[PDB]
Design a binder for this molecule. Structure first.
Ligand SMILES: [Hg+2]
Ligand SMILES: [Hg+2]
Ligand SMILES: [Hg+2]
Length: 480
């Protein structure tokens, strides 16, 4: 699983000490954190391509904080895809609270950019503006997260036309395909370095892709000092990492889904005041189980076209699913509903020409076996979707490097049974749908749970004991 990018420095250099940062950055992070800072002060821009799940953002936060204790942060810009925008806020506010940030959506409006340490924004939110160009930002981070695939375009011309003093770029894996993107990013980070696009492709792209281990090695050589990339499989790193890393993957609902949600929300209320008793615990639990399906995929209700475009989960899943693939992982996707499972299998199975053994309850032991066997042994099989309700018939998922909870998991006994993260470290993803019971319940639980952990049981159940006042708080869609 070779895919590690070097940049000499692991013997000395300024192993900076994270500043006001609530966390114990594994050694490999304190380094990256520092290396970036180093190259930044030196005046070079760099790309951090560590496998998704090793927290390039935390390191980037540190890079941000250490540039605070030096009067080189206020103001900095971070251009991330809507999706990750939550992850960012999630982490600044938490890890580096002492750092002022603010999202920058549509129209100009109230500007205090210069007064804010960092400001968040989307590529699009750039493509149509001016407000920012005026600003002279210290840092300018381009977070090309696992976002779809086409990142380049007139967008870079916009970015690559701003005013920074420091430049970082968080990305997936320098895939030999990314070549043409490599020019765009390297340029952004270090302008001129590669010349012109025309020039680039001409002597690098067309040849390398056309099989030229010559210009290939060369290009690698020339950029080597500006790209740092650690691998979840790097022996040196397998160690510093926990058995399981937990990440929250956010997704935003399509306007269809959004509609179906608000609707299906009003329909439980405009028909609840009346009913009551266990004829409310059944009614509520019914709505919930529809909202959950809406977010998963509306084709689950309106029937119809089972496409990626109709589901925000599916879109995000697809991105995440894809980077993990490039990082050479083996993914396991779990879904509450059997049909969402088939949809997932289909979409993936089709869109990537590859088998996606699907495992669900009703299925002879032989199959569950042959399927899980197919996923375990066969290195060709890289996915497995599972829709199981039982405690754990007989699921052996030790081969999984990554796991996605398509449906909100509301467990250790479960992970143990399925053998997740037993004989390999494993990264686990929880899909969250912004402005949804999926998000709010995620909130109320971490509230205390000193009354919810020992007492109350599984997620679905109790959500119904909620008295209208808060039920209308938790489930009510929330988009400002
Ligand atoms: Hg790169
Ligand atoms: Hg963003
Ligand atoms: Hg979603």
């Amino acid at each position: 699983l070779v895919p590690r990018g070097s940049h000499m420095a692991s013997k000395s250099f300024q192993l900076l000490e994270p500043y006001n940062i609530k966390a114990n950055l594994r050694p490999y992070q304190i380094k990256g954190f520092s290396w970036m800072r180093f190259m930044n002060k030196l005046g070079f821009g760099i790309c951090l391509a560590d496998d998704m799940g090793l927290g390039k953002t935390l390191q980037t936060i540190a890079v941000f904080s250490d540039a605070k204790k030096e009067n080189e942060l206020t103001p900095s810009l971070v251009i991330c895809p809507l999706s990750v925008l939550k992850n960012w806020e999630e982490e600044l506010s938490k890890f580096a609270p002492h750092l002022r940030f603010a999202v920058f959506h549509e129209d100009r409006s109230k500007i205090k950019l210069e007064d804010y340490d960092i400001i968040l924004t989307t590529y699009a939110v750039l493509l149509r503006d001016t407000r920012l160009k005026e600003v002279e930002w210290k840092y300018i981070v381009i977070d090309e997260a696992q976002n779809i695939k086409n990142p380049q375009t007139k967008i870079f011309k916009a970015v690559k036309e701003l005013k920074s003093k420091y430049r970082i770029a968080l990305t997936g894996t320098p895939i030999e395909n990314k070549v043409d993107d490599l020019w765009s990013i390297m340029t952004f980070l270090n302008p001129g370095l590669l010349g012109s696009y025309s020039e680039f492709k001409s002597k690098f792209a067309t040849p390398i892709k056309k099989g030229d281990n010559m210009a290939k090695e060369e290009l690698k050589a020339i950029i080597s000092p500006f790209i740092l990339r650690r691998t979840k499989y790097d022996k040196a790193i397998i160690n510093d990492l926990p058995d399981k890393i937990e990440t929250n993957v956010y997704c935003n609902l399509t306007p269809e889904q959004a509609a179906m949600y608000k609707a299906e929300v009003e329909n439980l209320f405009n028909n609840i005041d009346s009913v009551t008793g266990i004829k409310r615990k059944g009614m509520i639990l019914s709505t919930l189980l529809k909202l959950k399906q809406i977010v998963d995929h509306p084709a689950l209700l309106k029937g119809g076209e089972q496409s990626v475009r109709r589901s925000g989960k599916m879109i995000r899943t697809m991105e995440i699913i894809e980077e993990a693939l490039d990082e050479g992982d083996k993914i396991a996707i779990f879904t509450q509903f059997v049909d969402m499972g088939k949809i997932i299998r289909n979409i993936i199975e089709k869109e990537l020409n590859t088998e996606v053994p699907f495992l669900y309850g009703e299925l002879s032991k032989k199959e569950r076996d042959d399927i899980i066997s197919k996923f375990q042994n066969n290195p060709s099989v890289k996915f497995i979707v599972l829709s199981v309700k039982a405690g754990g018939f007989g699921i052996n998922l030790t081969s999984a490097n990554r796991v996605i909870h398509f449906d909100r998991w509301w467990d250790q006994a479960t992970d143990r049974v399925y053998r997740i993260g037993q004989t390999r470290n494993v990264i686990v993803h929880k899909l969250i749908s912004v402005g949804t019971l999926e998000e709010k319940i995620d909130q109320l639980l971490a509230f205390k749970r000193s009354l919810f952990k020992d007492i109350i049981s599984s997620g679905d159940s109790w959500i119904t004991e909620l008295s209208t006042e808060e039920l209308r708080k938790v489930i009510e869609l929330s988009v400002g």
